[PDB]
Amino acid sequence: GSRQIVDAQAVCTRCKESADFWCFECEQLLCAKCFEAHQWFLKHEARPLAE
Amino acid sequence: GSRQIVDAQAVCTRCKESADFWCFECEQLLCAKCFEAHQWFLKHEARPLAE
Numbered sequence: 799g800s801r802q803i804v805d806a807q808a809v810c811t812r813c814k815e816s817a818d819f820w821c822f823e824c825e826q827l828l829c830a831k832c833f834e835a836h837q838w839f840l841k842h843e844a845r846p847l848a849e
Numbered sequence: 850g851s852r853q854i855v856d857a858q859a860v861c862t863r864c865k866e867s868a869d870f871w872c873f874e875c876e877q878l879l880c881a882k883c884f885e886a887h888q889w890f891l892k893h894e895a896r897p898l899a900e
């Protein structure tokens with residue numbers, strides 16, 4: 799849910815910041831509070847926002 | 850020798866962003882790229898930036 803001049807394509811979609819990883823399956827960004835909740839909520843693999 | 854380490858900002862001390870957790874002992878902010886490694890490199894007690 800991002801649009802109207804976002805100016806930020808490297809941060810959690812909900813917090814909009816404090817995130818450096820994006821779920822490969824969900825194709826969405828998640829902050830440490832979310833990335834850690836997912837990897838703990840079950841079994842998921844996320845990649846770093848870097849190249 | 851003794852030095853002051855305070856940071857009112859809420860982001861990694863190195864990346865300066867993409868962080869939502871800080872070590873209580875080191876009193877430093879770390880991003881998902883550093884926090885994940887920190888907990889995997891050693892055992893430290895950190896808390897979420899939320900409150």
Ligand SMILES: [Zn+2]
Nearest residue numbers: 821824836842
């Ligand atoms: Zn996911």
Ligand SMILES: [Zn+2]
Nearest residue numbers: 810813829832
């Ligand atoms: Zn989030």
Ligand SMILES: [Zn+2]
Nearest residue numbers: 861864880883
């Ligand atoms: Zn960092």
Ligand SMILES: [Zn+2]
Nearest residue numbers: 872874875893
């Ligand atoms: Zn530490």
